[model samples]
Target: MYENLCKPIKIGNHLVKNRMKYAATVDNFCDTKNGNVIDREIEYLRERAKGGFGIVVSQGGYTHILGKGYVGQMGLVEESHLPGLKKLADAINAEGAMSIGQIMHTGRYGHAHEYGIHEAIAGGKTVGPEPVGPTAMSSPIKRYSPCREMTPEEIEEQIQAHIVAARMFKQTGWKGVEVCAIVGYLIADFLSRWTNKRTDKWGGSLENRARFLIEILKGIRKEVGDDYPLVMRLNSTDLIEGGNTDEEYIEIAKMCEAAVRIDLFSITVGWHESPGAAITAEKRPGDWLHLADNWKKAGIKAPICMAYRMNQPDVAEKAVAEGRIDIWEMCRPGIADPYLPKKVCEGRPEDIVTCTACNQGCFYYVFIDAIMGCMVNPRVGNEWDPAYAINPAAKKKKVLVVGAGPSGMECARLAAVRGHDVTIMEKSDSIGGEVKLGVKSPLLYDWAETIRYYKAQIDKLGIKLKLNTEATADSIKAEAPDVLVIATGGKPSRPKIEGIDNKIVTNVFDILEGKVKLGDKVVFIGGNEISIQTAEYVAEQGKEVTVLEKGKHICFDVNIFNILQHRRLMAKLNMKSMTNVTINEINDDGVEISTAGGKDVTIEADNVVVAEGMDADDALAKAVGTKIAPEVYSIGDCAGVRKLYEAIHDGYKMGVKIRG
Candidate 1:
């Protein structure tokens, strides 16, 4: 079925086994202070290679110490990094996958203070070096301090540093090297007119601006020989004001092709400061094909690969079949299920665990200074841990999983797959606790796949599913399972406000499940993810919605990508938000709230919706805590209100731990 995808495609001197390539993403698995790739990072890459990816690209490594953007970013600036680089290459090569190192030099996007230095180097010289870009402009994110311009000598030094890093990677057994010429890095900063404001040979005209990239490629070619694969990640469109346009990128691609025998064009969209959605559920699968297609149409004769939300095999097959893209690339998908290529080759596409593009565990974690991970797949960072391995249980036992939410479903699916007899008891008539409400928003409908996958797995493993059956202590004892897992999920927290029990007031769950109908004039009591999405959903139905939040921003806890989407949708719908506000009363007419400055405001509405958040529904879990079975475990919201990722991961670990 995936004939074209499985076909070998020659990229430069080496021929990849298949068209599938694991694109690089920020995975801060290295030692932050020293910038060395740890064994955990090596195992992470090895697992992806082992799962059947033809080509595995390492995370973006800072080519120079001054280019560090994130904490725990992998480094390639010094000889001391060779040992870790060699180990990484060996790990991928051991799995018979071609290894390519992605070399990056963060410019104004770099964190200068992170390396214990007060200055950041870039394309042009600045007055002081707090943070340097092509010009001395302030960062769009505002978090980065004012930047200094790079001198001509500093630019030459960076180009040489990049060449040295490429040689080091090549010497360390890496078959190829990729230059990250996108995302507002140093190279990209030089390429982009918005950042490159120098009046010298390195800026101004398109050729001069692209001189940074072309020179680096030529330098690397001279250092690593002509046959080495050289990949350049280009931004098809920077998606920022005053950045590279379509024509400009086409010209840049042609310039690189002419400068050096560029092997592949890894096309991506957006810059570091781009306001558009880089990765989010709102974007349809394979919606980014046009970005690559534009290059091909512009006569840029290079093998083009594109990745954003190309999660489905069918979309990839069509893209390749249509000659729109030469290779299908994805990072989050392989992180969610590294066996994606194998499943497609085996004609078992349904067996693949799809990435929902939540970005909660992946990008969110990295942005928060933690290691990257996957939401649906708990075995992501812990690939080398035997405890997470899905081994056959030593002793098969009857496993009764209470609550059919994400946590309960995950536990039941794993325990049954591990050779244990599993039965799930759900209080509701269906699966997906909060997920069902999440899918109510058109943007989050993909999350329903999790439930579908769980149901299919439960059926495949012959696990009994009791819908609409709430598990009580007596009933749990009657089932007499060897292990009991309580995952009843969470309940809505109904704040005690004046007239909160009024008939006009309702909750988000009630609105999402269609149990309660909202009026044209609606006032929401919270500004979290649930509240924001629910308000937008109702607003899409032509209802006027006003959200009162005690925080500074609505849906502030959401991932960066999703938050952008939420802001866009909310703006489109003209949804009103009053932040730093406290609700004084919910009367039959509307809501009376006081702002942070003690300004009392009354919003008129026909209905009031409470979405303050959820509290743990731990009644059943506490009732049967170690009383019904020797291996009783409480998970999900019932244990404590957390995200879907945490709940599912908790259930997965519990299932593995219970296997005797």
Candidate 2:
């Protein structure tokens, strides 16, 4: 079915098994204090290799101290990292997948937040050396340190650092090396018009801008030899006004090809600060293919691989067949399901898990000082941990779960797959709970795939389902299941406002579910992601919407990488919003708010929607109190409102652990 993607392709002197390449993604599983690859990191990559990816690119390791950008970054500066690096390379090669090492230099974003010393640094303390870039400038992204211009000696030293890192990768059994020249990294800073203000040979015209990347490529070729494979992740378009032009990037690609005989081009789009939809859910699937096609048209013949929301194998197969792209560069997809290529090669693409690119769990967790995870696949950061395994249960138990949301369905699927008697009861006619309503939000439409996957699994695994069945202690006693799970989800919180009980006032569910029709003007009372999405949904309907948030920023709870997307969407919609406001009343006309400056203002609206928050529907769990079954569990929204991954992980933990 995917012959084009399954066929072998040569990369430099080495040959990959197929066109499916597992792109380098950060999991922060390594020893961050040192640059060593921990056992967890090794196991993580080993799992990907075992899944049958042709080429597996390791997460970028900082080539120099100034390059440390990630909160928990890997180091590749010295010979001391060889043991861990070699262990990483051997595992990938041992599993029959080609291993490629990446060298990263974060530049201005360096060592800004290591969490160990990052908090202190944020509090006006300097832990590591100041980050250096092409020019001295403050970071547009918050928490990143402002940078001073790199000295001539420092720039020369930084170039040598990449060469040293490349040599280390070659010595450590890695088959190839990939340089991190994309985004707003050190090399990017030298190449970008936005950051590179140097008047010397390092900057100025396009030729000077090419000097930093050229030097590193040429130096690696001299040190590691010309026969060794190399890939440079180049931006097809920097996606910034006044940034590297599309033609300039194409020229940069040609420059690298001549300088180092660059084996492959891993095409990426957008800079770290680019407002354009890059990796977020807002970006269309395979929209990035045009980015690579530009390079080919520019006369760069190197095989182009891209990894920005390009998860569909069918799309990849077509693109490859049409000669649009040569490789399926998978970053988040590999995390969602490492065995994706194996499933497709075995002609069972249906078994492959869908990566919706929700951005709620994977990179979101890592940025907030927690371990990274996937919403669809719970065993991401914990791949090395045996307890996280979803093996068949030791003993089968009769499991009855209340609710057909992500949590209940997850439990039912896991229990049934473990050879248990599983049944799910949903009060509503259909499943999905909040997710069903959430899909109406433009960016979250991909989340509908979760419902599709769980539905298919429910049918395939033969799990019994009872719709329009409300769970009670009596109903549970009738089923007589050994385990009773309360996954009843949540209830919308009714905030206290003077006119909140008025007929004009409603909730996000009412507005989204079409229970109530809206007028031309709408005002939302909440400022969370859900509130913003619902506001956008209404805005798309040509309604004038205004969102009032008591916090400093609207949708502030979102991840660092995706918050800009919300901002961009709001700007595109020309949506009106206010922050640092106190809601005094919800009037029949609209809402009354007192700005931070203490001026009272009224916003006129035909309807007022409250997406304030959700409260756990744990009353059932408390009332039953385990009297109905031998084993009782209350998980997901019943216990607490959680992100999609947290809720599913909660149910998954309980489902596989239940016994007869």
Model 2, runs deviating above 4 Å? 112-128
Best candidate (score: lDDT): 1
Give lDDT per model, in order.
0.85, 0.84
How many Å off is the CA of 295 in candidate 2?
1.4
| TM-scores for the candidates | 0.96, 0.94
Candidate 2's TM-score reads 0.94
The residue-by-residue lDDT of candidate 1 on 594-650, one tens digit each, is 889988888999989888899999888777667679788889888889888999899
For each candidate in turn, give its C-alpha RMSD to the true structure in angstroms. Answer: 2.2, 3.3
Clash pairs (backbone) in predicted model 2:
none
Candidate 2 per-residue lDDT over residues 1-660, each given as its tens digit: 889999999999999999999988777787867778888889888989999999999998888665777766778987788999999999999998999999988887676435444321211234346677889999776767788777777788778889999999999999999999988888988999899999988999998988999999999999988789988898888888889788888888888987778888998888767767788887767777887777877888779888888878888889899888888898988998899999879987767778988776677776565667788888787778887777876777788989998888888888898899899999988888888888888778777777777777888899999999999878888999888999998887987878888888989878777899889999998899888988988998778999999889888767777677788888889899999999898878898899999999998999988878888988889888877788888889888887677788887888777764
